[PDB]
Design a protein around this ligand. Structure first.
Ligand SMILES: [Mg+2]
Ligand SMILES: [Mg+2]
Length: 58
RNA sequence: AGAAAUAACUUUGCAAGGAGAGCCAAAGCUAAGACCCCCGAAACCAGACGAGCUACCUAAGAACAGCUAAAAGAGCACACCCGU
């Protein structure tokens, strides 16, 4: 084929070369820094923030 | 001191079928990736431990000078007790 000819002049494939397909492994989000975490997205004081808002549909 | 589903979005496989039984299917299924904090009440209920402090009670013991007065929850006043 065409690509199979490309592989001949590249380095050997091994577990040091692999990669995920771009766009698959979305990066993670952690509350650290001035953007992600100062209130970590939970908003001002209120039962929204503490994780105590009424049941779904109240 | 940011743990996780329901959908959605992205990338793969296979595609009228997907999935290694059960499930879904009028382009859908299978897989992965992403997203939901920490400290703090007065309390409540159950079972234990406490009357060597203090409140009261029981058994058997102990103390209460001297003076005045004689059988009195008597007067002055030590030990003793209390705490204006
Ligand atoms: Mg996380
Ligand atoms: Mg006693």
């Amino acid at each position: 084929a065409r690509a199979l000819d490309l592989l001949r002049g590249l380095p050997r494939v091994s577990l040091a070369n692999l990669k995920p397909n771009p766009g698959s492994k979305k990066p993670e989000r952690r509350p650290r820094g001035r953007r992600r975490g100062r209130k970590c997205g939970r908003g001002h004081k209120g039962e929204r923030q503490r994780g105590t808002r009424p049941r779904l549909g109240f």
